[PDB]
Amino acid sequence: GYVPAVVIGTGYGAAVSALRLGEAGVQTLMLEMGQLWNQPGPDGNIFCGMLNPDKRSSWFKNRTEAPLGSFLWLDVVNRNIDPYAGVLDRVNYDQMSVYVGRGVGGGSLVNGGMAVEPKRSYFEEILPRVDSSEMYDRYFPRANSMLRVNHIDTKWFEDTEWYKFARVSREQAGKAGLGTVFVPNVYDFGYMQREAAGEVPKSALATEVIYGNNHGKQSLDKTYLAAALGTGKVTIQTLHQVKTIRQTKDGGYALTVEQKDTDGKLLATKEISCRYLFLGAGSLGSTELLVRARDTGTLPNLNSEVGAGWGPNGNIMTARANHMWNPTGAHQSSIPALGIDAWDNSDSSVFAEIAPMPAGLETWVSLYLAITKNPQRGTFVYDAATDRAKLNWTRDQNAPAVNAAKALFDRINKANGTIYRYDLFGTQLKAFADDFCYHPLGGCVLGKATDDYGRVAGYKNLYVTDGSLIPGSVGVNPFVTITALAERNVERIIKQDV
Numbered sequence: 001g002y003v004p005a006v007v008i009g010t011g012y013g014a015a016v017s018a019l020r021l022g023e024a025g026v027q028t029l030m031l032e033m034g035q036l037w038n039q040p041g042p043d044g045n046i047f048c049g050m051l052n053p054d055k056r057s058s059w060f061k062n063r064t065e066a067p068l069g070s071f072l073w074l075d076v077v078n079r080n081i082d083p084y085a086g087v088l089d090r091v092n093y094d095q096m097s098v099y100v101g102r103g104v105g106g107g108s109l110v111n112g113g114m115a116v117e118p119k120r121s122y123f124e125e126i127l128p129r130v131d132s133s134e135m136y137d138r139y140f141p142r143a144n145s146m147l148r149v150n151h152i153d154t155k156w157f158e159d160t161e162w163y164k165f166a167r168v169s170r171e172q173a174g175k176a177g178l179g180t181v182f183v184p185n186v187y188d189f190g191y192m193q194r195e196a197a198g199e200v201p202k203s204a205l206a207t208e209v210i211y212g213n214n215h216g217k218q219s220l221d222k223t224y225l226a227a228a229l230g231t232g233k234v235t236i237q238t239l240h241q242v243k244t245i246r247q248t249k250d251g252g253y254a255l256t257v258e259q260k261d262t263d264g265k266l267l268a269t270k271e272i273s274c275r276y277l278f279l280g281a282g283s284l285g286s287t288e289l290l291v292r293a294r295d296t297g298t299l300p301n302l303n304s305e306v307g308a309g310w311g312p313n314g315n316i317m318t319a320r321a322n323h324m325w326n327p328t329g330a331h332q333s334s335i336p337a338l339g340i341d342a343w344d345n346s347d348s349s350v351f352a353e354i355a356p357m358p359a360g361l362e363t364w365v366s367l368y369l370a371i372t373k374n375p376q377r378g379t380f381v382y383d384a385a386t387d388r389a390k391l392n393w394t395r396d397q398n399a400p401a402v403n404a405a406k407a408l409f410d411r412i413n414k415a416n417g418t419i420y421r422y423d424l425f426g427t428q429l430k431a432f433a434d435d436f437c438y439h440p441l442g443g444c445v446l447g448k449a450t451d452d453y454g455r456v457a458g459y460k461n462l463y464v465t466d467g468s469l470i471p472g473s474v475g476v477n478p479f480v481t482i483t484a485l486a487e488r489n490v491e492r493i494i495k496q497d498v
């Protein structure tokens with residue numbers, strides 16, 4: 001059927017858009033290919049933890065996987081599983097694996113909650129056509145409040161066993177002259193203190209994050225999406241995947257939408273039409289829809305920038321072996337709280353998460369997720385044979401990112417007389433994981449594939465809202481930027497277009 005506005009997906013861009021549309025009185029249908037995560041499972045919990053993965057952990061895979069960095073300790077808990085509509089999707093391209101959330105809330109279900117504003121000077125570099133004053137004066141504050149960002153208590157952090165791992169890396173970094181910063185989060189840190197005191201059910205302190213948090217984490221289903229539903233003007237249909245988009249002969253857009261069950265069986269194929277169409281299917285999903293539409297002739301006036309300009313936010317993972325006298329602890333909160341800010345906008349820039357590890361026994365490993373400044377970009381290229389966009393990124397394109405991460409961590413190793421681990425990513429000696437991405441950015445870049453508010457070039461009332469807009473890099477964990485940009489865009493689009 002017809003609905004005035006359709007939003008594809010339910011991640012950050014989508015959720016912001018739908019809230020503001022509903023508040024403007026626009027009846028809005030959100031179409032989400034994953035589940036609404038609210039049914040207690042066989043362990044009584046909605047989500048599986050990292051030490052008890054099951055089919056809930058994975059989007060249509062036949063075996064669970066260890067969290068990256070932890071195969072040596074967590075492969076023992078891996079099991080064969082039925083393909084199921086689980087929460088975390090490892091999307092494999094030829095030389096890159098991109099991890100995304102699947103469900104009501106998108107990546108907010110599976111991410112580490114880290115809510116970080118980009119450096120203004122870097123924002124101005126990457127998006128020079130955007131007025132940075134309204135971003136910092138209005139939209140970043142709006143995002144901060146709506147997301148329910150909060151801050152860890154410094155004395156609790158300093159004292160608790162659950163953050164020893166962070167304190168160890170802080171001390172090691174400090175010997176190299178490198179500073180750390182606290183990382184704001186949407187996980188309720190008050191709740192986390194109570195978990196450590198045995199006062200409330202554990203989640204972050206029970207090895208949960210990447211397959212969802214049963215408590216504590218204010219994912220988008222609790223924040224923007226709950227508010228959107230509260231307007232009375234928004235509904236969400238789950239296990240509904242948009243496959244194609246066309247402009248109807250009489251105006252507006254028509255979608256082919258597959259409804260599946262949680263086993264992936266096709267239940268129905270529906271045609272859903274609308275006046276206003278907002279894409280919030282993520283860097284991968286929105287880009288694939290538009291490359292498909294261009295190259296199959298259903299949106300033939302899309303431009304050549306559709307598909308272009310993808311980067312992995314410079315993501316690189318690495319690990320150091322601590323001295324025996326610097327154990328990192330068996331009990332590590334699953335929510336990071338500290339990072340190393342070595343980002344000055346130069347090509348040497350690194351902003352690196354001090355990542356917890358879930359093994360739950362002492363390994364002496366410090367793990368890091370580095371965000372780097374690497375100019376290389378990929379393109380999503382439609383394959384009509386398999387009906388898939390394929391990302392053409394090759395591993396050598398991450399060499400600048402590896403080189404930056406390695407220069408930084410080499411300083412820390414030199415100051416401390418430590419070495420890397422080489423065995424965390426596979427049997428081949430490899431200290432830097434260079435073929436994964438948690439932060440996909442680009443494919444439908446703001447001001448190139450779209451105008452400076454995400455209006456898709458060549459079309460009226462067709463909008464992109466999400467990580468596909470960002471030009472490959474933001475220098476920090478990306479969801480606050482996606483959120484704030486979406487606030488900016490939807491406010492302007494509603495004013496001028498709706």
Ligand SMILES: Cc1cc2nc3c(=O)[nH]c(=O)nc-3n(C[C@H](O)[C@H](O)[C@H](O)COP(=O)(O)OP(=O)(O)OC[C@H]3O[C@@H](n4cnc5c(N)ncnc54)[C@H](O)[C@@H]3O)c2cc1C
Nearest residue numbers: 009011012013033106107112113114242285467477478479
């Ligand atoms: C392991 C991990 C850790 C992370 N940690 C952090 C962190 O701590 N902080 C941070 O800032 N970022 C973090 N990120 C990144 C962050 O989660 C993403 O940048 C963000 O979720 C992207 O938002 P989005 O709106 O672009 O898309 P998404 O959040 O990916 O949402 C897209 C939604 O659209 C749905 N969808 C896709 N295609 C279709 C379709 N055709 N039809 C219907 N529905 C569709 C998806 O199922 C999904 O629910 C992390 C991500 C991962 C995977």
Ligand SMILES: [Mn+2]
Nearest residue numbers: 144149150151
């Ligand atoms: Mn604050």
Ligand SMILES: [Mn+2]
Nearest residue numbers: 045201214215
């Ligand atoms: Mn519980």
Ligand SMILES: [Mn+2]
Nearest residue numbers: 415416417418
């Ligand atoms: Mn030393």
